[PDB]
Amino acid sequence: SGMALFSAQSPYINPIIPFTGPIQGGLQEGLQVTLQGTTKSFAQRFVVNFQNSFNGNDIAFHFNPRFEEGGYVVCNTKQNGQWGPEERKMQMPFQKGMPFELCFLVQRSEFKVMVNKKFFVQYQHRVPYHLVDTIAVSGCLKLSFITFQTQ
Amino acid sequence: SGMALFSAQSPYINPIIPFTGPIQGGLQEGLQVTLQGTTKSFAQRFVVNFQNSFNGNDIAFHFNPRFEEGGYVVCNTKQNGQWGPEERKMQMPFQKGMPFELCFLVQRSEFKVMVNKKFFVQYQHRVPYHLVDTIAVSGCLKLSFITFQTQ
Ligand SMILES: CC(=O)N[C@@H]1[C@@H](O)[C@H](O[C@@H]2O[C@H](CO)[C@H](O)[C@H](O[C@@H]3O[C@H](CO)[C@@H](O[C@@H]4O[C@H](CO)[C@H](O)[C@H](O)[C@H]4O)[C@H](O)[C@H]3NC(C)=O)[C@H]2O)[C@@H](CO)O[C@H]1O
Ligand SMILES: CC(=O)N[C@@H]1[C@@H](O)[C@H](O[C@@H]2O[C@H](CO)[C@H](O)[C@H](O[C@@H]3O[C@H](CO)[C@@H](O[C@@H]4O[C@H](CO)[C@H](O)[C@H](O)[C@H]4O)[C@H](O)[C@H]3NC(C)=O)[C@H]2O)[C@@H](CO)O[C@H]1O
Numbered sequence: 059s060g061m062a063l064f065s066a067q068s069p070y071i072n073p074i075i076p077f078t079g080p081i082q083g084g085l086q087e088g089l090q091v092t093l094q095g096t097t098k099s100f101a102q103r104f105v106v107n108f109q110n111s112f113n114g115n116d117i118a119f120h121f122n123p124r125f126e127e128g129g130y131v132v133c134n135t136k137q138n139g140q141w142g143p144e145e146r147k148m149q150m151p152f153q154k155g156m157p158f159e160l161c162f163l164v165q166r167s168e169f170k171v172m173v174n175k176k177f178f179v180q181y182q183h184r185v186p187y188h189l190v191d192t193i194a195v196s197g198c199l200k201l202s203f204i205t206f207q208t209q
Numbered sequence: 210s211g212m213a214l215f216s217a218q219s220p221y222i223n224p225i226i227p228f229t230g231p232i233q234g235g236l237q238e239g240l241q242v243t244l245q246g247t248t249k250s251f252a253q254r255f256v257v258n259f260q261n262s263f264n265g266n267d268i269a270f271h272f273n274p275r276f277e278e279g280g281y282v283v284c285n286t287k288q289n290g291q292w293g294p295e296e297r298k299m300q301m302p303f304q305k306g307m308p309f310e311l312c313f314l315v316q317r318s319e320f321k322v323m324v325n326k327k328f329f330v331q332y333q334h335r336v337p338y339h340l341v342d343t344i345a346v347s348g349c350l351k352l353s354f355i356t357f358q359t360q
Contacts, residue, residue, distance in 0.1 A: 145297070146297040146298075180331065182331055
């Protein structure tokens with residue numbers, strides 16, 4: 059599929075939303091974290107957070123699709139409870155009430171984000187990704203699974 | 210300064226705004242294009258375009274600081290007269306009426322943009338950069354120089 063991928067941690071299958079769970083041993087270079095799910099018809103926004111611990115005060119990468127103002131997606135980092143400068147991509151690659159595949163690839167200098175197998179946005183690491191030991195997902199959606207795979 | 214840099218094309222010194230001029234032999238991997246100048250007090254927006262020819266219908270990378278809504282910067286690509294999805298960084302690293310150094314580094318997969326020696330934004334190549342043979346600069350500003358340097 060381009061490349062041979064191997065599980066790095068067992069999948070979370072049908073996780074309950076809102077979901078907070080471990081990324082075991084922390085994010086690693088070449089890790090692909092894939093979310094397969096569906097947005098609800100009543101969704102306005104949803105969030106995937108890659109964060110350090112359960113509390114949400116330190117979020118290395120906040121990925122936040124907003125079905126507002128035509129549809130756009132916000133990427134940001136939170137440090138000690140403070141949001142940094144937002145990066146917005148003025149495009150909405152998700153459709154309300156429709157299935158989606160969302161994949162985050164950890165590279166040395168950036169995250170690469172694919173939506174429905176197509177590249178969507180990159181995000182430069184502002185803090186070391188290996189400090190990320192938690193994924194948190196919220197919003198009006200369900201998930202079939204989250205997988206963790208490496209080359 | 211981190212690294213030894215060599216001229217790749219002779220600088221444009223005190224170019225007249227609005228400026229349109231050749232990038233000789235086209236953009237190349239590892240080229241650094243540096244703009245040194247000052248915004249006017251009456252500036253609202255300015256633009257640096259990396260483009261294919263003089264006409265502006267195909268702009269590989271449009272870099273557009275806007276002193277509006279608190280200050281933000283738009284990055285985009287134009288193909289056949291059509292703008293793609295905007296990438297906005299909700300931060301303004303320039304100050305009206307103040308000198309600035311603006312550096313574009315061409316890497317294999319992205320441009321990296323530094324403002325006043327600090328990283329500001331990356332922009333993934335949407336089209337091959339080597340098709341870019343023109344730089345165009347407009348807005349209420351003056352420039353001391355544009356240099357072209359490689360490692
Ligand atoms: C289906 C539907 O009805 N959805 C609505 C959205 O389409 C709508 O979103 C707005 O739609 C208009 C088109 O009608 C534009 O896409 C809006 O975006 C703005 O577009 C302008 C012009 O392209 C753009 O300014 C230009 O930017 C380029 C670089 O990209 C260059 O710098 C030019 O010099 C400059 O003029 C501007 O930045 C851009 N703004 C944003 C926020 O993206 C788009 O907002 C919404 C809102 O009306 O309503 C939906 O429901
Ligand atoms: C000096 C001065 O007066 N300049 C003014 C600007 O400061 C002002 O810009 C607005 O300033 C406010 C603070 O007063 C905010 O920074 C505005 O940005 C919005 O902030 C909200 C809350 O942080 C943010 O939503 C949050 O986003 C995070 C991720 O970043 C997360 O998803 C949260 O769930 C969410 O609530 C929102 O996205 C952000 N919007 C923008 C457009 O950046 C900022 O606009 C302007 C405008 O009033 O006036 C200047 O003159």
